Amino acid sequence: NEFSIGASASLWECMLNGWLGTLYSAPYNLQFEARIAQRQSLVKQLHERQLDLLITTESPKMDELSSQLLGNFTLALYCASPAKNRNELNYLRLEWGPDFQDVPLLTTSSAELIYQQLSRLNGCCWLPARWAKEKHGLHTVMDSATLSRPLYAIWLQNSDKQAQIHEILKNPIL
Amino acid sequence: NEFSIGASASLWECMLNGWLGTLYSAPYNLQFEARIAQRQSLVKQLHERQLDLLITTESPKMDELSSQLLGNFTLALYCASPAKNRNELNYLRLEWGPDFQDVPLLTTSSAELIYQQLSRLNGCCWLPARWAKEKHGLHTVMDSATLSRPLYAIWLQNSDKQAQIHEILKNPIL
Ligand SMILES: [Cl-]
Ligand SMILES: [Cl-]
Ligand SMILES: [Cl-]
Ligand SMILES: [Cl-]
Ligand SMILES: [Cl-]
């Protein structure tokens, strides 16, 4: 049946859509579900055998789960203009997981949504640098560091699809 | 504090991002959360006062909830080529709610994800016609009807923010 991969809207938009595209020419024949849901729902679904694979930047409680570190990607603080300091902007919140972090004018889990809004909310937000570089009108905020996130695959250790999980994770995301 | 609006990834991508943009120049001062989550989580969150407003194409069980019909939008079956019949294509599944509907090669809740994938999966899928028209390389499948969905606002009838819900719903989405 369908192999389900779950992740936040921003991971699908910024990196997993390309990776999923490569799985259709991999040496096997599968149908896929690209599931977009909140972290607590996806983690519960792994335990209930309702989700096959979770991709995330933070490992959850690991009892009865397995994890594999896939890589690491850079994160920078972007705005729509050059030469701006953070105190001249509205800090918008793109969700990056519980451990990553005035009320923000906008909070969301979609990088594309926060990118569209940033140009009309005098905004800045933390975005994946590789994805942000191919957008127009993004400039790093001057008083800011380059940060990063790890990327993990999480699955049920006793999953009935451990064989297919092992082969899918041979295709690199980063 | 933040006013939370919840909807599927596809409603945010196809129509609610523009609507949210108009709320920042409305005659009031609010900060917003554009929440993307699965239907069962958003409905539970309304009941638990964790979500202020749900936008959806299908009314859930309505005990202790209120609803307002906002409008109706057309849905057509699109593929990447002119003059194709559905039996020449791979039918991909974009989620449209429990009542809307071979294993599909792809199933997702993001219209942008299914649009990117459609060009490499010989695919067709049901997309909002207004949004699809501004994309390049989409053509309606020849043997297919134009369908539609209603658009509803759902909220907790006894919400402590009924006043702000009433004013937000005065800004038209469609
Ligand atoms: Cl995730
Ligand atoms: Cl969810
Ligand atoms: Cl994540
Ligand atoms: Cl929805
Ligand atoms: Cl919906």
Residue numbers in the entry:
A (entry chain A), B (entry chain A): 45 to 145, 156 to 228
How do the authors describe this structure?
Targets were selected using a shotgun approach aimed at uncharacterized metabolic proteins from ST23 K1 hypervirulent K. pneumoniae. In silico multilocus sequence typing of all K. pneumoniae isolates was completed using Kleborate. This analysis showed that 64 of the selected proteins are part of the K. pneumoniae core genome, defined as genes present in at least 95% of all strains; the other 132 proteins are part of the K. pneumoniae accessory genome and are overrepresented in the highly virulent hvKp clonal group CG23, which contains ST23 (7). Thus, the x-ray crystal structures presented here provide the basis for functional analysis of 12 uncharacterized proteins associated with high-risk K. pneumoniae infection.
In all, structures represent both metabolic proteins and possible transcriptional regulators.
